Amino acid sequence: AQYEDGKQYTTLEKPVAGAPQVLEFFSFFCPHCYQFEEVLHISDNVKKKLPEGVKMTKYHVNFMGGDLGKDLTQAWAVAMALGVEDKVTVPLFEGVQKTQTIRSASDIRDVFINAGIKGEEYDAAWNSFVVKSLVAQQEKAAADVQLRGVPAMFVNGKYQLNPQGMDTSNMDVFVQQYADTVKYLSEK
Secondary structure (H helix, E strand, C coil): CCCCCCCCCCEECCCCCCCCCEEEEECCHHHHHHHHHCCCCCCHHHCCCCCCCCCEEEEEEHHHHHHHHHHHHHHHHHHHCCCCHHHHHHHHHHHHCCCCCCCCCCCCCHHHHHHCCCCHHHHHHHHHHHHHHHHHHHHHHHHHCCCCCCEEECCCEEEECCCHCCCCCCCHHHHHHHHHHHHHHCCC
């Protein structure tokens, strides 16, 4: 068959009830995540082929970069609470992986200041209980699927994308197959 369990996707033996419909995990320390977002633009091309009625969720993970890793997961919660994901994602990736100017929670904050978010607003978000629960959501979701690596994408708590089983000669063609797989899986 064209789409096969064990080749373009794997089925979770231990399904997760009530999961987001499309769920993406990444880390700003994650080199392949840097590719997915900055070069391949995976999240975007997936969104563009998702049907009627399907929202996309993206969460940060703790298990890379130690202390900064956790800080970055709290910062991503802030980004989610303020709705500024599209404004900080690129400078956060580049500050961590390209220029290496992000070395502390303070440097993370700087990226949000430069992106135009008020410090007063960032600090209140950072310290608020709504962010803490948003931090907890991110962790619970990663835990539910026993997540040990990123990037990763899950569809309806059922299926995990398996990009290893896709041609990578042309980037554009990998991206669309990936996107097409997500759409297929979604219509399942």
